[PDB]
């Protein structure tokens, strides 16, 4: 049985299927994410190095759900226009559960064929996994600004950037107080 259940199982009717998908997608798209022992585990998850593969998948599904909470409050339809342009000269639009944009997402190999695909929560979560798989494994840590540079998931998501704000403080607190982490 699972020891940790993601927050979207409490909030959305389809949350259990989101979890099922995320566990599968972590296997396939997050093999590097699941192999990292992050340098900021003492902050996010003190017992991380003791976690089994299955427990790491439960951990990451939970953390993803906390990011979704603060990026979109679990609203897959969310569409927020940013100030900057993309390669066509149109303003970037952040979409879906993790507020990813199509040009940036596709650079990670997410293969969104249409803007509508980012509003598919499963595709959106898979892309989030690809982004974490890239940066957490490259940088060897979950977040933080180290020697002038944002690292891990904080390269992409504001909610993972340390500051005196509700999103970051909640994500860190909820993570470090998971029974498997503490």
Residue numbers in the entry: 73 to 254
Task: Quote the study that presented this structure, word for word.
Here, we discover a family of Bdellovibrio proteins that define a new subgrouping of the lysozyme superfamily and demonstrate that they possess outright specificity for deacetylated peptidoglycan. We solve the structure of family member Bd0314 (that we named DslA), revealing adaptations to the lysozyme fold that sterically restrict the active-site cleft into only accepting polymers deacetylated at the GlcNAc positions. We determine a role for DslA in B. bacteriovorus exit from the prey cell and demonstrate that exogenously added enzyme is able to prematurely liberate predators from prey bdelloplasts before completion of the predatory lifecycle. The architecture of DslA is related to, but significantly different from, other members of the lysozyme superfamily but still fulfil the inclusion criteria for the lysozyme superfamily noted by Monzingo et al. — conservation of the β-sheet floor and helices D and F, with appropriate placement of acidic catalytic residues.
Large crystals of a catalytic E154Q mutant enabled us to solve the structure via Sulfur-SAD phasing, finding two disulfides and two methionine residues, tracing residues 74–254 inclusive. The fold is comprised of seven major α-helices (A-G), several smaller 310 helices, an elongated β-hairpin (b1–2) and a smaller β-hairpin (b3-4). The fold is stabilized by disulfide bonds between C117:C253 and C182:C199. A second acidic residue, E154 projects upward from the β-sheet floor of the cleft, and its conformation is stabilized by a hydrogen bond to S166 and packing effects mediated by the hydrophobic sidechains of Y152 and F156. The pose of E154 is further influenced by interruption of main chain hydrogen-bonding: the backbone carbonyl groups of E154 and D155 point downward, not participating in β-hairpin formation. The net effect creates a bulge and allows the sidechain of E154 to face upward, directly across from E143. All four of our DslA structures (two wild-type, E143Q, E154Q) are highly similar, other than a relatively small flexation of the β1–2 hairpin in the E154Q variant. Variants E143Q and E154Q clearly fold and retain a similar active-site architecture (as judged by our high-resolution structures herein), but display no notable activity (middle), confirming their participation in catalysis. Residue E143 of the conserved ES motif would act as a general acid, protonating the equatorial linkage between MurNAc and GlcN, with E154 acting as a general base to activate water to attack the MurNAc C1 in an axial orientation. The structural equivalence of DslA E154 to the β1 secondary catalytic acid residues of goose-type lysozymes (also GH23, but with a second catalytic residue lacking in the lytic transglycosylases), v-type lysozymes and chitosanases, and our assay on the E143Q and E154Q mutants argues for an inverting hydrolytic mechanism for DslA.
